[PDB]
Design a protein around this ligand. Sequence first.
Ligand code: 80I
Ligand code: 80I
Lengths: 298, 292
Amino acid sequence: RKMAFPSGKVEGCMVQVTCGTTTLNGLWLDDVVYCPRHVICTSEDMLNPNYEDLLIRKSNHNFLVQAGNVQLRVIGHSMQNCVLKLKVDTANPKTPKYKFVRIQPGQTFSVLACYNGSPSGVYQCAMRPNFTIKGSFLNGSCGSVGFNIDYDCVSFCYMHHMELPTGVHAGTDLEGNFYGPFFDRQTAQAAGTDTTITVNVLAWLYAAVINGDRWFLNRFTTTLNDFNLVAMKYNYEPLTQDHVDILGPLSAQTGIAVLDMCASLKELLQNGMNGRTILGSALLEDEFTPFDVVRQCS
Amino acid sequence: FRKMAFPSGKVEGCMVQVTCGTTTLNGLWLDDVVYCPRHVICTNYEDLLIRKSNHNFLVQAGNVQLRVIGHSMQNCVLKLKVDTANPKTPKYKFVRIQPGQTFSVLACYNGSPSGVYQCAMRPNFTIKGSFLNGSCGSVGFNIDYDCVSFCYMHHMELPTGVHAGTDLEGNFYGPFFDRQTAQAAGTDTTITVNVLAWLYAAVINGDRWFLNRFTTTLNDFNLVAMKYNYEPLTQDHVDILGPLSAQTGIAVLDMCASLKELLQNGMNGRTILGSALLEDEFTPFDVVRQCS
Ligand SMILES: COc1cccc2[nH]c(C(=O)N[C@@H](CC(C)C)C(=O)N[C@@H](C[C@@H]3CCNC3=O)C(=O)COP(=O)(O)O)cc12
Ligand SMILES: COc1cccc2[nH]c(C(=O)N[C@@H](CC(C)C)C(=O)N[C@@H](C[C@@H]3CCNC3=O)C(=O)COP(=O)(O)O)cc12
């Protein structure tokens, strides 16, 4: 299954931020609230906002931060890239142990979809190689965050900003830097051509081997360079050393070398599946990470 | 449009670990009662329970131990009365869901929540979940205006890999029983009303390739549906699909003709919302709640 992390530690951090008639979601950690900076924007200055100039015309008392219907008094404000940081006079007592991290394409995370500071649902997302996610977001969702949880430490990696004309979604890390070549303005922007997440397909093949489905295992190997050149001819991502390293645990568990599995996938790309299934599916799955695979058997 | 689970925080605060002897599983702590699968007492259930004392039960809520001051059994569920009320108890109800309805599962191990995902109660009263050793006592639920409706407590994995469990009154969904015994489910069928709901979701999200100019009657559609092991579509289902048909301007029986064509022709390697298979685990409410 696509399995999200339990969302409770994040739910306790969700607030709403209103500037004018514009309300979006914010993230309340200790005595700072993080939210998309375009909350300060007006309907007439959003085609290309001068955020620096627009923020100079703003004061602490222009910002309405609410935990539910309880107002949190704002005592400071600053901008860091595309996020606004509102210092408030109350430390959130539900603040979990947390980190801010920037994830890489192929990595998965849970999204807590929120409207008016109230969580509405949770689901797993994979960052595509073109730095979009296939999410489920409506108006009012901006400021919803994505996260992973490791040993009760919440690593926030995504804050929601945009829906591209193709219906996929784009956002920033929690330091306000967009994933991919996008901008927080009211314009139609296009992602790069997407590719298949090779390291995740490999993890999926390891998962099939773990469960006894191993017809696709062959008697060949490859170099990583040779595989990377063939992979790109099939719209598959090239592998990095970090991808090879994160496949280590599954490689050891099955006893199938990473480069051996690469040679197995290489056959699958050049010969097709031939009406055979892998884990009961005609299509190769590329949104399970190596960690997701080990977790679903741990 | 994605499979979306309810936020799990209100349930996480209720999960505890229940231990009897060498057996441990998860329990649900609401006010001053912990609910868990009764086979936690096993190494004839009424005979085995009468032989247990309160002190045979260890209940851990995080790192604090709750003292069991009483115990009873309601069908396949054990009810352990504890000396502490759970301050995190949400407003809650116990409900028995209908086949074809969906819920969120909070998979837990050793009293610690691990993952959350959406399941449907299959027509054969199994669920297609993701549960491992130690997942017993994990619960399924829906949330409506901060009220948690608990509908499922997890008990077993069938040889086929699907899952079986009880409502919170301890009564199994399906013809299953809580013994260490291989059990087969009845023949499963596809939840027709949900497939139609999902095709409507695809149209609301700008996918229209499966639509056709044809229409069908309700009975003619049901003849083909039954031939393909789909559940019958009732007029109540047609009524429930009203909002989605109103939103999209596609009559329910028009969408039925689309589904009939899909069933007789196949998808021909094309895709709907990324799936090569017809999806039947979104209810009409699930589609409305998410698309709007
Ligand atoms: C002509 O221009 C366009 C053309 C074609 C495609 C386009 N797409 C966007 C866009 O995405 N614009 C951002 C705002 C900018 C400043 C980043 C936005 O609309 N974000 C939503 C979430 C979105 C809304 C629906 N589904 C989501 O994911 C917020 O949540 C904040 O807006 P709200 O105040 O809540 O309505 C503009 C645009
Ligand atoms: C001959 O026997 C069999 C043959 C063929 C298939 C079979 N299937 C089962 C079964 O499922 N048996 C229940 C216990 C009975 C008494 C209800 C069980 O094992 N439930 C798990 C969750 C399970 C564990 C793996 N995935 C899950 O969903 C608990 O959580 C409690 O067990 P644990 O103490 O946690 O290990 C027995 C059996």
